[PDB]
């Protein structure tokens, strides 16, 4: 009874250390508290020396007394992966938070699992159709490549990726995994109910004809569950992947989440900063995120994870982090939606591995190309137009300034899903139309 | 909790240990009586290896090593004082502050017949 | 409290045997009653008291080097970086969570040293130097130390052979010498890792052109990148045929911190044998930025002091000991060659930074890619 | 030689000498006779300082529970550490000292909710300030509640008019709604919030019990003197029969300002929860960030941008998604919130306002170069 049951020595916020005086846990096994309000599941993060664990809270410690007997589960968090997880809802611990009772596991895996090796890499460049004008020209996304969407609170990073719900995950043929790590419970609910509507997520007997398993860890959750909320999500779509063999899409709303709240839990276990108030351990923790999210031999993971760039700074270490895991980043800009301009897609900031003549052929590159030359050229003219006017310029340049200013106002876009509160309908746009168009 | 004044002030840490020492020994009367035990328990620290382990060695639990330390000394002869603080030195694994203490300790006795 | 009291403690003053010979006697059936919770006693061999964020402190190894290779019992080697006065602090060459308190750690004897020679030539090799391409291990090859010091003044000789890159921007206007450290700098997407691997397409271009001894070696060391990435690379170096001449070293982001901080020099270590015996070698440490955030990561988490945008003090002499490795031998040292070329990532333009302006005033020339002669269509974009 | 491992001493708990001194006074055969340092429901405060009392014992004592002092001032345990317990005093901490005792209530840091709480002027602990007696018709409840999840939400589908021209027809707010109001300093933000409280109280009168709107009023950070000001305007316009006030004040101490904001949140959360509509106004929302970022810095947390915590994000979130429209098998209830932000020379990219607009739903730009033009109010 004494055995592998250690106390409660120490709770700093969401950090508690758990004092194991017959044999410690491993790191990243799951400790569960005997006695709490809610079910408060701990994960070891450090090894403290003195028969201490420095363990992580996935719920709220309010409550919480230095002696409460804590029981070490023996493995990491387990989450219910499979077919039995499309269409339910489940938390960063795998519990069904849906009230549809509790959810069929296929298997329960390890939310921890190592990176897929370099012997288990697929390089296939194939094109994915988004219908969006500029990712289709500009910066095309590959089929089983790794999407950034990096964006400044209030870009439209969150219309965006819906727009890309909407337009790539009903074309697609496999299962969809929602991540939803950091952002509005709102918007959680609104997601469910959009897609029980639509008929990608059944209730009931239908359940098995579902198409997406959402995970949510939004923010009103401790930083403990938001920093483990994208490995539940990961797993489900892991499982997908490797298991099942299927093609997955992953769509991640706001993977900077996942590195704020381990910022926020660092501070509490006793780490020296690193550049401007981040963990040290930012690219080591966001590298062994996002390697686990990779079109192996035996499997595809689409993954679209919106980035959120903190004060409109691409500088900071968190998006200058996650710019070197992706294949084709969408960086959204402030500018661009201040005049109007939806998707407010920075053109002369979005690149893809997918802009190479060999992959996409020679025409759309070279449109591409000119379209981002005529772009910079505009862009090197905005400080003679401003402090001189554009009667100053020079014929060939009024041209110029002429073109960028329709080629401009040509890569914006209405959207299916934005229909709602702009009252246009939403354009889908074929390749050829862009090209052409261009 | 009315207790005698030190005769003179000292350090933080490991001379306050022996000032609150001195302090509680004072009251018994019994300041000759635990200063030849912390001479002893010195002594005893070089003795064996075993019992310098209970202060140097970092993976004995604090369980053991307090285990070791009450049920070794089952009265011994010895004031309760020595024995209430050898265990409470022995619940940190602070045993190693006792060679320290001894020096404040002597410092605040031969200030103690000026 | 001062020491010569605390020294006379040492000469016996007990005056009273009251309580020596009643514990004494004690003690043993005291200690034997718990000998099932001690562990065994460490002077050798190493115990780690914690573990945490690839971080070992380990209890005892008396006899440990700085920068030596210790092993742990669980299999996952360690490097011991700073040897302080009650624990070793060891860096954990893996994921550390096979490691608990109390777990042994064994003192392997050797500084750490990865396989060189012609057998890693076409290999795909992690930062420590195990082959990671699913090929087998390393035949036909040697251990050599990662910290060799570089070669001084009476052991290099002028940099006079081109190795041209293939590059013409490059070729006319930043010409490259056979021994010359040149940076390769610029923002995200802006064509430096082009840059290095069109030079090592032409090197293979060019070896199948000249007598055996002007032939260059290229080895690539990707630190950070994502393994896609590097898959990528390695398919573009077997489509090509470059691969018979290339190594390449890749420790990515799904690796530990001192795995990360190690490749560059794993890659200077497999790039020096040809430097050593004659031959002329090609050596591109691209992304020398992540590399000096990985030792920003290694260094904070055995608490050191940071500095310039928490850097340590010492993440110049991180740069500067690997790059001067670069060289020209004289004729008496076989006149063999490196040529180094690292990539540094700027944020947006700014070459004002700390490891920027590090490896610029190290390196011997720049080359500078803009994001504005980008996408004006100069491509490469060569400031 | 055998006494050279022994010669400096290197230990944890740095309050050891506590440590020995509850063991060494009872060894006193004289003070065996009652004289027990009560460290199980008590504890005495080792250091104080800076707004963090720390205090030895409190051995049973809960993370994030309302401990008392016996001066009355009240605290909470926020740092349960393996020696001492981190304490944040939640008033003035010059009534505090080295050796007092601190009592723990048994109950996480809780305020008085329900329907005695309208029409009082309240602190940011929830002890009435108005000088009208004790809340009588109330109850206790926690002011850290985890917002309601996904299925406990419904979608917004009823309007709640600000009764302002500019936002009821350009901006439309509903019922669940989070709405930032942003912008400069003196560009009618608290304007459009008091609007948007009188109108609830002119439109509470035409409609059936089960559609009005009872609002909460956190005022952090404001001076004592426009708080009165505009307990005096919700008196004479009759809106403070559906509106209660949480004031915490500029002269008051930083953990009540940081705790006001979730004070008001639970009050108004009373309503949310009981099948009714709450609307919850956080004027100058920047200023509990503040308040929250001194916390942070004297209890030597490692700051990050602009000097702000790490958690600041999480400080809001908290907040505002409490929140939400609830659903028909959850009463069906309301709370609506409208934080207000304030902006340095109208820099919207700043910290705490991309934060906050990363949180809420939509935003009210309130510019300050058209409420000099007299276009009053003034919204981008
Ligand atoms: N000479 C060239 N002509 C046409 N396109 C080029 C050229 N050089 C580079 N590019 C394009 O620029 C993009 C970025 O290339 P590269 O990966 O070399 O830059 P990088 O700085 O290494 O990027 P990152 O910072 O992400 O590692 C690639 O998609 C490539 O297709
Ligand atoms: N619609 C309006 N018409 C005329 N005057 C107004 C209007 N709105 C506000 N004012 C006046 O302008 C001033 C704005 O004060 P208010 O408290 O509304 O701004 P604020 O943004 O809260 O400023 P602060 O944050 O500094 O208190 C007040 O003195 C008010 O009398
Ligand atoms: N494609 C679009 N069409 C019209 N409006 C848009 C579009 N994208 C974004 N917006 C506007 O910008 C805001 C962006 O909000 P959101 O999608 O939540 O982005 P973020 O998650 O970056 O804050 C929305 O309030 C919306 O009004
Ligand atoms: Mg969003
Ligand atoms: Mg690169
Ligand atoms: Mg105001």
Same mark, same amino acid.
């Given at each position: ?229 994208? $490995? ?10 490797? @298991?099942? !063999?299927? *093609?997955? %899409?992953?769509?991640? #709303? ?120 005529? $772009? ?10 401003? @402090?001189? !006017?554009? *009667?100053? %310029?020079?014929?060939? #340049? ?41 | ?114 | ?383």
């Amino acid at each position: 009874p004494a055995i592998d049951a250690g106390y409660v020595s120490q709770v700093i916020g969401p950090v508690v250390d758990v004092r194991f005086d017959g044999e410690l846990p491993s790191i990243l096994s799951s400790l569960e508290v005997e006695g709490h309000s809610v079910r408060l599941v701990l994960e070891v993060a450090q090894h403290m020396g003195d028969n201490t664990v420095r363990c992580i809270a996935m719920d709220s410690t309010d409550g919480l007394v230095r002696g409460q007997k804590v029981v070490d589960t023996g493995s990491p968090i387990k989450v219910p992966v499979g077919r039995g997880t499309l269409g339910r809802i489940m938390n960063v611990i795998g519990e069904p938070v849906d009230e549809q009772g509790p959810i069929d596991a296929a298997d329960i895996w390890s939310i921890h699992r190592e990176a897929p090796e370099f012997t288990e890499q697929s390089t296939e460049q194939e094109i994915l159709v988004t219908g969006i004008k500029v990712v289709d020209l500009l910066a095309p996304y590959q089929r089983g490549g790794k999407i950034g969407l990096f964006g400044g609170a209030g870009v439209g990073k969150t219309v965006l990726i819906m727009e890309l719900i909407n337009n790539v995950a009903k074309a697609h043929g496999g299962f969809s995994v929602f991540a939803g790590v950091g952002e509005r419970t709102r918007e959680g609910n609104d997601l469910y109910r959009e897609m029980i509507e639509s008929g990608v997520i059944k209730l009931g007997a239908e359940r098995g004809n579902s198409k997406c398993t959402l995970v949510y860890g939004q923010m009103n959750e401790p930083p403990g569950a938001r920093a483990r909320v994208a $490995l539940t999500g990961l797993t489900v779509a892991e499982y997908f992947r490797d @298991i099942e !063999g299927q *093609d997955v %899409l992953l769509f991640v #709303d706001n993977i900077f989440r996942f590195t704020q709240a381990n910022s926020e839990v660092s501070a509490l276990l006793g780490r020296i900063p690193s550049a401007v108030g981040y963990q040290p351990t930012l690219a080591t923790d966001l590298g062994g995120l996002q390697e686990r999210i990779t079109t192996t031999t035996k499997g595809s993971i689409t993954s679209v994870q919106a980035v959120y760039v903190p004060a409109d700074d691409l500088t900071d270490p968190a998006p200058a982090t996650t710019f070197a895991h992706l294949d084709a980043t969408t960086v959204l800009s402030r500018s661009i939606a201040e005049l109007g301009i939806y998707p407010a897609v920075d053109p002369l900031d979005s690149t893809s591995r997918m802009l190479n003549p060999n992959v996409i052929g020679a025409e759309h590159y070279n449109v591409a190309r000119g379209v981002q030359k005529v $772009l910079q050229d505009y862009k090197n003219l905005q400080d003679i137009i401003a @402090i001189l !006017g554009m *009667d100053e %310029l020079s014929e060939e #340049d009024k041209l110029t300034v002429a073109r960028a200013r329709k080629i401009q106002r040509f890569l914006s876009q209405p959207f299916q899903v934005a229909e709602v509160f702009t009252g246009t309908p939403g354009k889908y746009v074929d390749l050829a139309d862009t090209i052409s168009g261009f | 909790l009315k207790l005698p004044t030190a005769p003179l002030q000292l350090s933080g840490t490991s001379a306050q240990i022996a000032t609150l020492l001195w302090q509680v020994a004072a009251k018994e009367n019994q300041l000759d009586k635990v200063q030849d035990e912390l001479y002893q328990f010195i002594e005893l620290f070089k003795q064996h290896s075993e019992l310098r382990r209970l202060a140097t060695d970092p993976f004995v639990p604090t369980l053991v090593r307090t285990k070791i330390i009450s049920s070794v000394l089952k009265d011994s002869g010895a004031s309760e004082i020595t024995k209430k603080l050898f265990e409470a030195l022995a619940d940190e694994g602070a045993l190693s502050a006792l060679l320290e203490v001894t020096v404040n300790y002597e410092e605040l006795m031969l200030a103690h017949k000026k | 409290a001062d020491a010569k009291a605390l020294d006379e403690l040492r000469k016996p003053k007990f005056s009273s045997k009251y309580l020596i010979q009643h514990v004494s006697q004690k003690l043993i059936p005291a200690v034997k009653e718990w000998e099932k919770s001690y562990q065994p006693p460490v002077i050798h061999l190493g115990r780690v008291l914690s573990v945490g964020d690839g971080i070992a402190r380990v209890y005892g190894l008396k006899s440990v080097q700085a920068g030596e290779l210790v092993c742990f019992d669980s299999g996952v080697k360690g490097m011991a970086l700073n040897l302080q006065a009650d624990h070793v602090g060891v860096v954990v060459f893996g994921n550390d969570s096979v490691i608990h308190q109390g777990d042994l750690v064994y003192r392997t004897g050797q500084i750490v040293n990865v396989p060189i020679g012609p057998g890693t030539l076409g290999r795909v090799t992690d930062g420590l130097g195990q082959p990671i391409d699913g090929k087998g291990p390393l035949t036909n090859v040697r251990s050599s130390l990662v910290e060799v010091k570089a070669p001084g003044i009476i052991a290099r000789q002028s940099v006079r052979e081109p190795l041209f890159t293939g590059v013409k921007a490059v070729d006319a206007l930043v010409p490259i010498g056979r021994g010359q450290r040149e940076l390769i700098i610029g923002d995200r997407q802006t064509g430096k890792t082009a840059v290095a691997i069109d030079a090592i397409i032409h090197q293979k271009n060019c070896n199948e052109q000249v007598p055996k001894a002007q032939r260059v070696y290229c080895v690539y060391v990707a630190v950070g990148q994502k393994r896609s990435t590097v898959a990528q690379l390695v398919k573009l170096f077997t489509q090509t045929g470059a691969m018979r001449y290339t190594i390449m070293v890749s420790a990515t982001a799904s690796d530990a911190a001192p795995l990360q901080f190690l490749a560059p020099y794993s890659g200077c270590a497999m790039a020096e044998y040809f430097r050593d015996t004659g031959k002329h070698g090609l050596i591109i440490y691209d992304d020398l930025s992540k590399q000096s955030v990985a030792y920003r990561q290694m260094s904070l988490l055995l608490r050191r002091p940071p500095g310039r945008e928490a850097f340590p003090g010492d993440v110049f002499y991180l740069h500067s000991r690997l790059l001067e490795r670069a060289a020209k031998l004289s004729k008496e040292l076989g006149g063999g060659s490196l040529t180094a070329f690292p990539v540094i990532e700027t944020q947006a333009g700014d070459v004002s930074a700390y490891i920027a302006t590090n490896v610029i005033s190290i390196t011997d020339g720049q080359i500078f890619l803009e994001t504005e002669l980008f996408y004006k269509g100069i491509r490469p974009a060569l400031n």
